């Protein structure tokens, strides 16, 4: 067997104006979507952006999933689109015994949740998953060096082109000059009936737009941002294996029944082709597609989402979680670029700076009382990510970072200055970015551009 479908998400029908900017869209759609932590939105009937390619000249190794609830998955032939769709379209059709389109929404969901409670059920799938490159890219226009047809040069400067989205000025992971392609990029998913994607938030919280470009629907389970710890205790309690590198991280299938059940709420949705689902920050979300599909999906930072970013990497520190980022790296870079930032990004930018060098001088006086004196000025955007760990909690340094000529090479952030080694406090030396001298100034650079 029994399935209870969880209450609908939100449903969005933006008109023109409201949709010609994403940013102020979801920016107002915001107080309703973020309780429910996913929202559905459908744009406007004549917005088609046009979907062309090759079925034979898209490649693509797709990964194997043994549907199995509970069961730890971490975060096989070459196909071609065509013969992933033959053997996809062959699947769902002897399945059910039926024409592939005949197969109704709520069978498939109901089937799911019953193969991947049945131990006595086998049945593995394939799930094409992966950023765009020349082998296989966007769904959306993007410029070439191929001339593009007129409704191709429609749809290339849309907002709603996810391959824009990133790099708008209302965006801040847009700014970030290290190469995060992971989270600037859009990935592409070419599914099949019942290939999933396991119950997880997005990497710093960030959020999420997903479009699905053609094929058969992908169905969505949505728990809002502030249920997260209360989804975490309950998956401890049921899975404690997924718990206990970035590339290493678990995940799992679990029925929302069973979240809904321990009090955690819980939205679903079918995203049929045309329309968009956007996760909100911390907003846990699973699914699984109902047959052939295509959809490209990309992580985004709004305003909105800064001080969550700066929460995140707190809560990364404590779980000794790696990042993808600095966050502090990624301030300081806009306020060096304050000149040219839109004036709300500068002004919640300042925010956030006023923030980050409080807790700084907090932490730098905390170290000095430990006897730390000796210090010396770091560059630590030169060092490549691997370089600058806290060899305790993991954590990207930026700001700051202790030392010891004892372990060479080896780093502790501020939180961690008694474990980097057993030496005394006044052989280390603190390696810092900026003096609060430094500091000062950049954050007034971004007051005088908010003021204007
Ligand atoms: O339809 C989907 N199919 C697959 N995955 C999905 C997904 N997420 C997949 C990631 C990972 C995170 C890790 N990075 C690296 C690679 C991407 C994050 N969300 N969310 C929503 C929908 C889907
Ligand atoms: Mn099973
Ligand atoms: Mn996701
Ligand atoms: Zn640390
Ligand atoms: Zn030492």
């Not at 015994?97 to 109704?104: A, G, I």
């Given at each position: 067997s029994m399935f209870l479908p969880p209450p609908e998400c939100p449903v969005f029908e933006p008109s023109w104006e409201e949709f010609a900017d994403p940013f102020a869209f979801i920016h107002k759609i915001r107080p309703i979507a973020e309780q429910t932590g996913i929202c559905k939105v459908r744009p406007p009937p004549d917005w088609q952006p046009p979907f062309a390619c090759d079925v034979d000249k898209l490649h693509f190794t797709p990964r194997i999933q043994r549907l199995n609830e509970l069961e730890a998955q971490t975060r096989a032939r070459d196909y071609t689109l065509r013969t992933f769709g033959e053997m996809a379209d062959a699947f769902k059709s002897d399945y059910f015994?039926?024409?592939?389109?005949?197969?109704?929404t709520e069978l498939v969901e109901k089937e799911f949740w019953r193969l991947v409670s049945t131990i006595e059920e086998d049945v593995t799938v394939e799930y094409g998953a992966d950023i765009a490159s020349k082998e296989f890219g966007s769904g959306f226009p993007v410029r070439d060096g191929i001339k593009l047809s007129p409704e191709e040069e429609e749809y290339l400067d849309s907002g709603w082109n996810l391959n824009n989205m990133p790099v708008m000025e209302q965006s801040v992971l847009a700014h970030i000059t290290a190469d995060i392609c992971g989270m600037k990029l859009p990935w592409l998913y070419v599914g099949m009936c019942f290939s999933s994607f396991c119950w997880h938030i997005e990497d710093h919280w960030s959020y999420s737009i997903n479009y699905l470009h053609w094929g058969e629907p992908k169905t969505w389970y949505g728990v809002p941002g502030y249920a997260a710890e209360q989804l975490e205790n309950v998956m401890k309690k049921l899975a404690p294996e997924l718990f206990v590198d970035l590339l290493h991280q678990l995940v799992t299938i679990m029925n929302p029944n069973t979240l809904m059940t321990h009090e955690v709420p819980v939205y679903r949705t079918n995203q049929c082709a045309g329309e968009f689902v956007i996760t909100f920050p911390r907003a846990y979300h699973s699914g699984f597609n109902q047959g052939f599909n295509f959809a490209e999906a990309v992580n985004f930072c709004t305003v909105d989402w800064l001080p969550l970013g700066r929460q995140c990497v707190e809560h990364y520190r404590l779980l000794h979680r790696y990042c993808v980022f600095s966050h502090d790296e990624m301030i300081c870079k806009m306020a060096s670029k304050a000149d040219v930032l839109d004036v709300v990004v500068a002004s919640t930018v300042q925010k956030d700076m006023a923030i980050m060098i409080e807790d700084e001088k907090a932490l730098r006086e905390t170290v000095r009382k430990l006897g730390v004196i000796d210090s010396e000025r770091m560059d630590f955007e030169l060092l490549p990510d691997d370089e600058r760990q806290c060899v305790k909690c993991k954590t990207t340094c930026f700001m700051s970072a202790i030392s010891c000529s004892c372990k060479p090479g080896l780093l502790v952030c501020l939180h961690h200055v008694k474990e980097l080694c057993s030496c005394p406090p006044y052989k280390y030396k603190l390696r810092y970015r900026y003096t609060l001298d430094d500091l000062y100034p950049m954050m007034n650079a971004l007051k005088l551009r908010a003021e204007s």
């Open positions: 015994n039926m024409p592939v389109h005949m197969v109704p």
